[PDB]
Amino acid sequence: WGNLGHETVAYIAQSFVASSTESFCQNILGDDSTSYLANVATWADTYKYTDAGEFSKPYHFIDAQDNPPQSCGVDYDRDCGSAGCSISAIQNYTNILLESPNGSEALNALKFVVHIIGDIHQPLHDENLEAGGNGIDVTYDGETTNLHHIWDTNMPEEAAGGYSLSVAKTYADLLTERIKTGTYSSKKDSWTDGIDIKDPVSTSMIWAADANTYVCSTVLDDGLAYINSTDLSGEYYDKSQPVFEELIAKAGYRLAAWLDLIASQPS
Ligand SMILES: Nc1ccn([C@H]2C[C@H](O)[C@@H](CO)O2)c(=O)n1
Ligand SMILES: *[C@@H]1O[C@H](CO)[C@@H](O)[C@H](O)[C@H]1NC(C)=O
Numbered sequence: 001w002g003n004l005g006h007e008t009v010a011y012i013a014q015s016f017v018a019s020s021t022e023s024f025c026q027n028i029l030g031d032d033s034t035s036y037l038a039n040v041a042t043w044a045d046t047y048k049y050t051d052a053g054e055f056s057k058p059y060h061f062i063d064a065q066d067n068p069p070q071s072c073g074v075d076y077d078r079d080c081g082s083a084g085c086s087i088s089a090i091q092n093y094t095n096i097l098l099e100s101p102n103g104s105e106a107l108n109a110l111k112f113v114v115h116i117i118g119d120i121h122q123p124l125h126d127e128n129l130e131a132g133g134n135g136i137d138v139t140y141d142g143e144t145t146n147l148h149h150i151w152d153t154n155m156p157e158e159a160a161g162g163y164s165l166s167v168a169k170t171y172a173d174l175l176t177e178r179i180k181t182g183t184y185s186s187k188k189d190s191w192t193d194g195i196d197i198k199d200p201v202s203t204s205m206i207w208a209a210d211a212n213t214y215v216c217s218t219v220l221d222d223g224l225a226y227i228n229s230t231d232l233s234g235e236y237y238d239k240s241q242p243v244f245e246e247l248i249a250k251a252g253y254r255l256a257a258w259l260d261l262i263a264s265q266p267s
């Protein structure tokens with residue numbers, strides 16, 4: 001996601017974590033503010049472009065070698081690669097937090113988890129084709145961009161009505177009520193099924209596989225001819241919106257559950 005989506009995921013998670021989990025996270029981050037998760041949710045995206053952080057660029061995605069839109073699927077060992085991936089980073093950083101939450105690696109680990117659980121829920125971060133859709137040029141509201149950029153940025157910002165932290169908090173609040181009492185309320189108990197703190201690979205693969213299905217069902221089902229030649233701010237936006245909103249909600253709800261597990265510090 002772009003910044004807006006990450007911060008939204010973060011604020012959603014803030015709305016669900018146990019108070020003890022809040023305290024655990026704040027102390028790790030050295031951030032006692034009311035935006036403790038959202039404040040750090042974008043760091044990994046600028047860090048990866050620094051000298052020191054370059055190693056972490058591949059941790060943002062898993063390049064699924066499938067065949068969309070007619071066949072989708074992700075496979076850890078096939079797709080991750082020898083320099084790491086979103087799944088491997090979830091395992092690494094979760095384990096740092098479980099083993100050494102008071103160590104010097106905890107701060108970046110938590111920032112990584114917050115960010116990467118959001119990226120896993122962006123369907124094109126679970127897809128190899130054209131560099132996760134970066135190589136698919138499209139028109140959006142009369143401006144040339146690419147398919148990855150519109151899923152990360154153009155469509156979520158359009159839906160949220162902007163890009164600031166305040167806009168992210170309001171959007172998170174809207175999706176949070178959808179979870180608690182609204183249209184996701186019946187489905188959200190199933191959103192944390194199979195969650196296992198002792199198996200980060202399996203757990204984060206569930207989530208990556210969930211997002212990846214939408215590559216076939218939603219992202220690319222119109223066919224590449226259509227995507228190449230149609231302004232995607234119209235009917236494409238209209239059908240995409242409920243899909244990326246549910247995935248942002250799920251990322252926030254699942255991040256919260258994962259953080260509660262981490263903070264529980266199980267033997
Ligand atoms: N195979 C790729 C390559 C990149 N990206 C993401 C991470 C980059 O920050 C962004 C734009 O290059 O797209 C992705 O999801 N999958
Ligand atoms: C685990 O995290 C540390 C700290 O960023 C990093 O140096 C290392 O590359 C990671 N290990 C694995 C196995 O990905």
Ligand SMILES: [Zn+2]
Nearest residue numbers: 001002006119
């Ligand atoms: Zn992102």
Ligand SMILES: [Zn+2]
Nearest residue numbers: 001125148152
């Ligand atoms: Zn992206």
Ligand SMILES: [Zn+2]
Nearest residue numbers: 044045060119
């Ligand atoms: Zn990222």
